[PDB]
From a paper:
SEC-MALS analysis revealed that LZ formed a stable homo-tetramer in solution, while CM2 behaved as a stable homo-dimer. Intriguingly, although CM2 showed no tendency to tetramerise in solution, apo-CM2 crystals contained two copies of the CM2 homo-dimer that interacted in an anti-parallel fashion to form a homo-tetramer. A splayed C terminus was also observed in crystals of CM2 alone, indicating it is a feature of the CM2 sequence rather than being driven by the interaction with the LZ. Zn2+ was not included in our protein preparations, so it must have been incorporated into the dimer in the bacteria and then retained throughout the purification process, indicating tight binding. Addition of EDTA to WT CM2, or mutation of the Zn2+-coordinating His and Cys residues to Ala (CM2-HCAA), prevented dimerization in vitro, confirming that Zn2+ plays a structural role within CM2. The HCAA mutation perturbed Cnn-scaffold assembly in vivo, although not to the same extent as deleting the entire CM2 domain, suggesting that Zn2+ binding enhances scaffold assembly in vivo but is not essential.
Author numbering:
A (entry chain A), B (entry chain B): 1082 to 1140
Amino acid sequence: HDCAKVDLENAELRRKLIRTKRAFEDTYEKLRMANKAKAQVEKDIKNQILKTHNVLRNV
Amino acid sequence: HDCAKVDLENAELRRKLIRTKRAFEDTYEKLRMANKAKAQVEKDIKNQILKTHNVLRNV
Ligand SMILES: [Zn+2]
């Protein structure tokens, strides 16, 4: 048994295990931001139609 | 340290690392097939946006 190496390996595994989770969280939020972005798009076009309609109402 | 406890923790760290990797693999594979299903819809949407983009060319 290598007491120095096993403590070092556990520190390496724990450190990297944390690196892995935070990478996913970033991705999760990134996907979360992307989906909400395309959600807005459907409403933006609907909004644009209303404006254009209101513009042509003024006649 | 505690050689018995640290080795058991080391086995736990590797174990948890395997679950995360398999969790990613599960997600990736599920996502890979899922994207292929929605892919026809996505190109159709891209075309209408592109078409509408082309419509606004009039100046
Ligand atoms: Zn030891």
